[PDB]
Symmetry: D3
Subunit: 262 residues, 6 copies
């Protein structure tokens, strides 16, 4: 249990070919995407987004990977800011595996919306959060606004966007913006523990819950994900197989043989 949860982690490198990020995977199922541009507090540029999309797609399709971690190189910044990033936001959202934001230092502007899109956020004590749109003539009125309101509520979301202040780790925790705050030195340790707890659980259940939680926000786009999971489940049932069996066996499909539950 605990000892297993805190066992060391061996990161296998998969960064070959990438320029702005590092991409790594552990034997037990964690993929980590790290923004590697600390000279600029890990702000992203178009290439960085293109690379993260590629890396996240890789994780999605790697059947040994169960959880993805998003983080920034170093301890001073997760991501200080930036529009292909809209694609990336959708990709995080629709990923059937949990994505955890591991935040040390600055998570600001587009970088702040990135951590919010992640299913969970594990913050270090030196973490700082905030938006900058209105101070620099910009804004994210998509998930950056509505989804934030679903995390911290309408009063706080309006404060965050309208004033563009910075919030420390404690403030973030108190408003329910991050899931937990740990000392900088234990950030990886704690983040890896949370991932491992999720890895012990049913991947199909996580996938359906994530779609279900998205469906409270995304209208039909959410229904598409939720119903897609239902369809996938249905193919794995006897009645769902009677269809293909109808072909192979070459005959009329017979569902009269199947039961009808209330």
């Amino acid at each position: 249990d605990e000892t297993m949860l805190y066992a060391p982690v061996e990161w296998h490198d998969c960064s070959e070919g990438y320029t702005d990020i590092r991409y790594e995977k552990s034997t037990d199922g964690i993929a980590k995407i790290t923004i590697n541009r600390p000279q600029v507090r890990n702000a992203f540029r178009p290439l960085t987004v293109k690379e993260m999309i590629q890396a996240l797609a890789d994780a999605r399709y790697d059947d040994n990977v169960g959880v993805i971690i998003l983080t920034g190189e170093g301890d001073k910044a997760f991501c200080a800011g930036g529009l292909n990033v809209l694609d990336f936001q959708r990709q995080i959202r629709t990923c059937p595996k949990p994505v955890v934001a591991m935040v040390a230092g600055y998570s600001i502007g587009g970088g702040h919306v990135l951590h919010m899109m992640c299913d969970l956020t594990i913050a270090a004590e030196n973490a700082i959060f905030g938006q900058t749109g209105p101070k620099v003539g910009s804004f994210d009125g998509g998930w950056g606004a509505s989804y934030m309101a679903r995390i911290v509520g309408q009063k706080k979301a309006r404060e965050i966007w309208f004033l563009c202040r910075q919030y420390d780790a404690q403030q973030a925790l108190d408003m329910g913006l991050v899931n937990t705050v740990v000392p900088l030195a234990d950030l990886e340790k704690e983040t890896v523990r949370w991932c491992r707890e999720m890895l012990q659980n049913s991947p199909m259940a996580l996938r359906c819950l994530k779609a279900a939680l998205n469906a409270d926000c995304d209208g039909q786009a959410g229904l598409q994900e939720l119903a897609g999971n239902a369809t996938m489940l249905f193919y794995m049932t006897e009645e769902g197989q009677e269809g293909r069996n109808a072909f192979n066996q070459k005959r009329q499909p017979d569902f009269s043989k199947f039961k009808r539950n209330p």
Copy 2:
């Protein structure tokens, strides 16, 4: 297979204990609930509604029933409405019924009775069918599904016309605005309704319940998500991974989900 679809239908009575309705079941999986108060155009009383709720509850739990027909006694009225709010529980019941419910309408479907046919997944209408609301004329209204859901069927302009003026509409009018699925001769109302039921009966009962939930989900927010997510939970229990918990419990061990592959 028209000789099969239009094959004769053998109803079997199950109305013992009911006063205001008849309740019958065909040998091939169709349940029929008939309002039996033709003297007042099949309007419903609270008793009529209680009975309908019981009968529908029965059809839902009867493993031999795949589809349900809702209709009125005779050829002149489906249901003229509340005999001039228990009906609200019945509407929800039709809504969340995991089997298709079909309104077979001859003559009047008015007021509360018009909302009834609308709640049904499909409506098969005789050429003599007449439709419309009466609330505002008689100082009342159904601002629930009677309003919003109607708008998901005929569009906002037509829904506003139907409710604000309270006119009556003939079968062609209903058909043209998409309020009913088909119009057939009065004499063929039952054979045609039965054919539609049989076409649905040849399809997967699980696929139909999932689709019904999915279509409701476009309208019912979280209540819709509950229906849809509830179907996903049933499905999951019928898979290997969805049985590991149970297997694990029975074998006195920890569940191991590493045995299962992570799909993209």
Copy 3:
């Protein structure tokens, strides 16, 4: 009035015919449904659910009942969840939802899995200092993607909801309180005393008002299902007005309705 709010409560048993639950009513309008399977941390089985549905329907139609308490027998568990694939619990969930009377979860000890969704469905939750909360689904290969997910997010927010479901940890009373999952935490010895005080504060208010407010709060989540409840209440109210009675009068009097006299307000 402290004295009135903390006055002794007089319970009357209405458990006859029930096997898995107790059902009691107080002289001052509180109905209490108690899961009575403490040997299994009050886990529910199909019979238990059929019984709660029936007791809740009774409370719903009892004009002398204004509030309903849901709880578990003893101090060790509220409800540990489903017992050892039938899903009648979903009907029960909808029944709690559409009940026009406030439903309060009184939680001592464990509220886990399906048992956790039950307290969340309740309008309010009063927790004892020994209460423990959490889901188990993913940990045991199952899930509740209905109100158990979406409605939970409307209570604690999306970050916490994903955490609660993805990790399946257990949370203590202060943890739950801090995240807005329960309404208050009180000593275990005073659980019923405070719960009854909360019920009585609600009982001082208008049943019709609570009914409309509950429907309005549901409507922010339940789309057309929510509008149905809200519109049903408007319909009730309308029937209690002179304009709404002119229809029936015209009929009784078999003349045409005349709404000409009624003002057409802004």
Copy 4:
């Protein structure tokens, strides 16, 4: 019956102080707001919009008025569009007006003028009515109720066609796709419109108000809930 429905209509003038519109009321409960700029096909300018806002508020507050008709001067145009975006205010006022609003359309209902007839609860169209949007042709658009609400009337495929191509549609096309409620001969336009208004006027004004809010609530989230709850509150003060 029909005799009552088709009885002569007698308009009393309430246009004093208005420049771009006419405003009249019948004693049987109809208020009529007419855009009066036929020289430019009844296109509205900012002044026209504040006047309409002002006339609609008057109508809402006149307890003897149960239904409002919005129309254009003459037989050639209902409203050919905008010539400040205060029309968004007017769209919301029509929406939240507790009384039915009927668009009476002769000729052109185009661009901003098309969105105006759609906002109205009902649309009675003459045989010469022509409908359509123009935004994308002229490099603008109405992505509010002009898009979403339109989809709730004619469906998503048609709404995308109307907006993406900006064609003009005749009265028969409009009727077939559910865009207008009826089509009548140009000379019977007011006669039929007034008939529809009188049928509504025979009904419960409280019922109409609650239903309109209920139908808005299927589209306007919490803002629709606010209207509906406001009605429950009004009903409560009568129990």
Copy 5:
């Protein structure tokens, strides 16, 4: 020290009976309910005046933010025949400039719904919050209930409405019901500071973000606001000026000139 500079209010209350209406050279408009006798409860005329003043502020090009408060230190607004206050709530909501509730003392019943509708709430240490409707049989099931849930969550909203208790400033802050709590003597300088931080930001960004946040709640009504801001943004771009330019240049619009971004 620019944020805490003194504030010069200019009176614009001429003609009003129930309210005071003032403007700062700085760009802040302040609508003050002036009925301390009755704890600043509003009557229909008060609402009519508040609607008129808020419209003035909306149309005053020099005003960027609006403050709503009650006269004195004992009450913001104790509550409320015509329900014109519903129109005022919708006007606060659709106002393209942020509206800040400055609360000293009681914000109860209809007065509580009023502070909630405001984008932000600044409370003094002596502020008291809560509903009273069911105590009287009345109720606000519009934004008064659903919107409150979007602020404090469903459990807390049902509690607030069903029991009708009073909550102090700390409790309101702990639930996320108000944005901050400051001493009574600092209420105005703090509120002015928050306003000035907003006044330094892009007004166009703030209006877009306010519509985006409303849009998560108000369905098509919120879409109308957001799209309307899009239409306004479009008229200020080269492509959105091709129609007007084509006409002035006596020629047909030509959009082939413009790029088609991804």
Copy 6:
């Protein structure tokens, strides 16, 4: 103007590297994606989907492309369905594409193939087009946009009929119910589709992307808001007030917005 609409269209081949589809572009800005498996009535397999995704992404990033046509090789079929859920990504991609996507349907558009034409903004159908779902008949279903979005097109009664009975519908029936935009002779399918595309290409591309996002936003909750707001942000960057932020940084000074109006 009609002369221009019916001018010939020259397609330039961009099919290099594709196995299951053809991908072509006209000089006036039309990108066409053709499912090229007529021997199986143009059913898609996972590879087909991956290729369609790549081609649509290319069309999206091609500044010279303003409209996209999706069609199937030959006159007998648009797409007969699946030949495995990567198609869901493709549906999302058609939805969020900031350029109009037009389904050009000859013959069969069934099952997964029917949902595909429905996801397109518009559908131009030939006289011989046939439409329908098959899920429940073969123990499958599309409860996402296949259900809810369909209902936003033809209404809830028709949607329930289409899914529960799994019948086939001819071109006239489809037109009648609002499932397709127009029906043209088979021989003119190409001609008419290009005309419609050309009508769109004369309009503002920015206006079209904004309207498409606004129309999606009536269905897709926060996912639709992301799209609409994303367009608002793009518009904002093209205004002087948006540019003050970038210019400030560029000019080495803190941003100042006092210069801009505070419009009502």
